[PDB]
Design an enzyme around this catalytic site. Structure first.
Site, short mmCIF file in Angstrom:
data_model
loop_
_atom_site.label_atom_id
_atom_site.label_comp_id
_atom_site.label_asym_id
_atom_site.label_seq_id
_atom_site.Cartn_x
_atom_site.Cartn_y
_atom_site.Cartn_z
CG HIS A 161 0.19 8.65 4.08
ND1 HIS A 161 -0.57 7.51 4.23
CD2 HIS A 161 0.98 8.73 5.17
CE1 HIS A 161 -0.25 6.92 5.37
NE2 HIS A 161 0.69 7.64 5.96
CG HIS A 193 -0.23 -0.10 2.51
ND1 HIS A 193 0.16 1.01 3.23
CD2 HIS A 193 0.17 -1.18 3.23
CE1 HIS A 193 0.76 0.61 4.35
NE2 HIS A 193 0.78 -0.71 4.36
CG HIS A 217 5.25 6.02 6.12
ND1 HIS A 217 5.35 5.50 7.40
CD2 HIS A 217 4.09 6.71 6.07
CE1 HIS A 217 4.28 5.87 8.09
NE2 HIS A 217 3.50 6.60 7.31
CG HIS A 266 3.08 10.26 8.35
ND1 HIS A 266 1.99 9.46 8.13
CD2 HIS A 266 2.62 11.54 8.37
CE1 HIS A 266 0.90 10.21 8.06
NE2 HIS A 266 1.26 11.48 8.19
CB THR A 270 -3.24 7.58 9.35
OG1 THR A 270 -2.10 7.19 8.56
CG2 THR A 270 -2.87 8.78 10.23
CD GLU A 319 -2.55 9.47 6.08
OE1 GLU A 319 -1.81 9.33 7.07
OE2 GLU A 319 -3.30 8.58 5.67
C1 LIG Z 1 1.66 -5.13 14.99
C2 LIG Z 1 2.13 -3.70 14.92
C3 LIG Z 1 1.37 -2.73 14.29
C4 LIG Z 1 1.76 -1.40 14.27
C5 LIG Z 1 2.95 -1.00 14.88
C6 LIG Z 1 3.34 0.45 14.93
N1 LIG Z 1 3.11 1.14 13.66
C7 LIG Z 1 3.99 1.06 12.64
O1 LIG Z 1 5.04 0.41 12.72
N2 LIG Z 1 3.64 1.77 11.52
C8 LIG Z 1 2.41 2.41 11.22
C9 LIG Z 1 2.37 3.80 11.04
C10 LIG Z 1 1.17 4.41 10.69
S1 LIG Z 1 1.11 6.16 10.47
N3 LIG Z 1 0.65 6.45 8.94
O2 LIG Z 1 0.09 6.67 11.33
O3 LIG Z 1 2.45 6.67 10.62
C11 LIG Z 1 0.02 3.66 10.52
C12 LIG Z 1 0.05 2.29 10.73
C13 LIG Z 1 1.24 1.66 11.08
O4 LIG Z 1 1.29 0.29 11.25
C14 LIG Z 1 3.73 -1.98 15.49
C15 LIG Z 1 3.32 -3.30 15.52
ZN LIG Z 2 1.77 7.48 7.76
#
Ligand SMILES: Cc1ccc(CNC(=O)Nc2cc(S(N)(=O)=O)ccc2O)cc1
Ligand SMILES: [Zn+2]
Length: 257
Positions: free
Chosen positions: A93, A61, A91, A116, A196, A103
């Site tokens: 969006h 994605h 990363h 981000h 997000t 976002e």
């Molecule tokens: C199982 C497990 C899920 C999650 C995370 C912590 N999260 C991330 O390593 N990245 C991440 C970043 C965003 S964002 N777009 O808000 O930065 C959205 C969704 C994500 O999974 C650790 C372990």
């Molecule tokens: Zn993000």
């Protein structure tokens, strides 16, 4: 499972992730007349070591640039935090066209993309996995990207994409300091929010920069030319990966300025 298309996209996420309808969801529209200036907010301090840059990965994605996070070589401090937060990834969006793609929005205005820079609370927790579900576990700097002049700081990142065109491909990505991507002013907004995309944990303190950074129409095309399919399958461009803004539900967005 989940994605950004009609059947698996943001409006469908609540079916497996009920937290999608939560009280601390991200992103949000920042209404500048409703923000509250907070005098206790310290300046943002980033100190990143380019030796922590590790790998770039096509995750279907999106794409991620990951950092070694075994020690405090690369850290975020200040702002609303007493704890030091350890850099782990950045990363982007983006949207289908230049018209949308950020976002966060500011007074209803949509930008073309959003950067981000994500960190985890290493003062309190021992790992990203532990930190990720805790209310004070994650800190993410968001930078609004406004379509305009080509941004030369994006060059190493864009040049790396040709080696990770399809889902699951990964390559070393080394000797890079992502503070080079940040705007020259670090004036910010902050609010308590969430990841997000799934799993949408309400574990993020957001730091949203007031100043945008640039990106050209052609640099955005490079993002959109990444493929979400695996090698050998029909090409499916990654056209967009931004979530709609979510209700504040009585949260306050604070301003450092
Ligand atoms: C199982 C497990 C899920 C999650 C995370 C912590 N999260 C991330 O390593 N990245 C991440 C970043 C965003 S964002 N777009 O808000 O930065 C959205 C969704 C994500 O999974 C650790 C372990
Ligand atoms: Zn993000």
């Amino acid at each position: 499972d989940w994605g950004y298309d009609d059947k698996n996209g943001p409006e469908q996420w609540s079916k497996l992730y009920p937290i999608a309808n939560g009280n601390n969801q991200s992103p949000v529209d920042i209404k500048t007349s409703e923000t509250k200036h907070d005098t206790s907010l310290k300046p943002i301090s980033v100190s990143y070591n380019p030796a922590t840059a590790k790998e770039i990965i096509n995750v279907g994605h999106s794409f991620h640039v990951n950092f070694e996070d075994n020690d405090n070589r690369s850290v975020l401090k200040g702002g609303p935090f007493s704890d030091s937060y350890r850099l782990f990834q950045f990363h982007f969006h983006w949207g289908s066209t230049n018209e949308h793609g950020s976002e966060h929005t500011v007074d209803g205005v949509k930008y073309s993309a959003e950067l981000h820079v994500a960190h985890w609370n290493s003062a309190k927790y021992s790992s990203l996995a532990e930190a990720a579900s805790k209310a004070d576990g994650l800190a993410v700097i968001g930078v609004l990207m406004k379509v305009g002049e080509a941004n030369p700081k994006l060059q190493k990142v864009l040049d790396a994409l040709q080696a990770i065109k399809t889902k699951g491909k990964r390559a070393p990505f080394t000797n890079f300091d992502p503070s080079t991507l940040l705007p020259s002013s670090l004036d910010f907004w902050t609010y308590p929010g969430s990841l997000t995309h799934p799993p949408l944990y309400e574990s993020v303190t957001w730091i949203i920069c007031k100043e945008s950074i640039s990106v050209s129409s052609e640099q955005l095309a490079q993002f959109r030319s990444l493929l979400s399919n695996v090698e050998g399958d029909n090409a499916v461009p990654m056209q967009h990966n931004n979530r709609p803004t979510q209700p504040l539900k009585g949260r306050t967005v604070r301003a450092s300025f």
